[PDB]
Write a structure and sequence with these properties.
It is classed as immune system. The structure is a monomer. The chain has 2 domains: 105 residues, Immunoglobulins (Immunoglobulin-like), CATH 2.60.40; 107 residues, Immunoglobulin-like (Sandwich). Helices cover 0% and strands 52% of the residues. Strands 2, 4, 5, 6, 9, 10 and 11 form a 7-stranded mixed β-sheet that branches. Strands 13, 15, 16, 17, 20, 21 and 22 form a 7-stranded mixed β-sheet that branches. It has a 4-stranded antiparallel β-sheet with strand order 1-3-8-7, with no helix packed on it. The two termini are 33 Å apart.
């Protein structure tokens, strides 16, 4: 199959102090708790952080004004009292049996000045230039937590185009799950001494030019902490 499409509002405009609800629809029918909906916020300069996962579980440190739920046949993120710093692009991700599928993202605009209410690191190298047909080994160094206690995800962004889930590794086990789209193009591995996750992209091509993020994932919870992304450019 793999014809499932996730759609979100293109844009929403609000003011400080208002209640805004972003929704996430599945093309296959209703969104269910078996879609374990995740919500991720992109602030300017491609800074990602996960807010919600498992429909309603809250990421570490996410402000009280955010909450997740199912509303009718959609997943929904509600901001109860929007603040100017909430101006961002919000992406949902739905689980479809063996892969995550990201929506297109909602750009939230917060108009007018206002008020509002006021550790773990993943370290990725900024860039990598590769020659066609070669490989790259991408690193993601985790610090601040027990490395083997959390899964690690990899996400591809061709910027402007969208987000695509590549796959997942359990550091404790070495067990992997790959998006079929990348099952032979990508291999996930770890080094537990150095607490480093690695993704190898075999025999590259021009489509492969993108930013690749690693993201810490707690099963049933959020894709919470993200690396800065490695910009991989292919010489053409």
């Amino acid at each position: 199959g793999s014809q499932a499409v996730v759609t979100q509002e293109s844009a929403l405009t609000t003011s400080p102090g208002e209640t805004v609800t972003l929704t996430c629809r599945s093309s296959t029918g209703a969104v269910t708790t078996s879609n374990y909906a995740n919500w991720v916020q992109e602030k300017p300069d491609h800074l990602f952080t996960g807010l919600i996962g498992g429909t309603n579980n809250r990421a570490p440190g996410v402000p009280a004004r955010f909450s997740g739920s199912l509303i009718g046949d959609k997943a929904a993120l509600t901001i109860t009292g929007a603040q100017t710093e909430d101006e961002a692009i919000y992406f949902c991700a739905l689980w479809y049996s063996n892969r995550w599928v990201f929506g297109g993202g909602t750009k939230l605009t917060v108009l007018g000045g206002g008020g509002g209410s006021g550790q773990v690191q993943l370290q990725q190298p900024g860039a990598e230039l590769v020659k066609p047909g070669a490989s790259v080994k991408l690193s993601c160094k985790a610090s601040g937590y027990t490395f083997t206690s959390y899964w690690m995800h990899w996400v591809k962004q061709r910027p402007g185009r969208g987000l695509e889930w590549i796959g997942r590794i359990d550091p404790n086990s070495g067990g992997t799950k790959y998006n079929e789209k990348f099952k032979s193009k990508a291999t996930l591995t770890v080094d537990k001494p150095s607490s480093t996750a690695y993704m190898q992209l075999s025999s590259l091509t021009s489509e492969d030019s993108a930013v690749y993020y690693c993201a810490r994932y707690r099963v049933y919870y959020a894709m919470d902490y993200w690396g800065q992304g490695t910009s991989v450019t292919v010489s053409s």
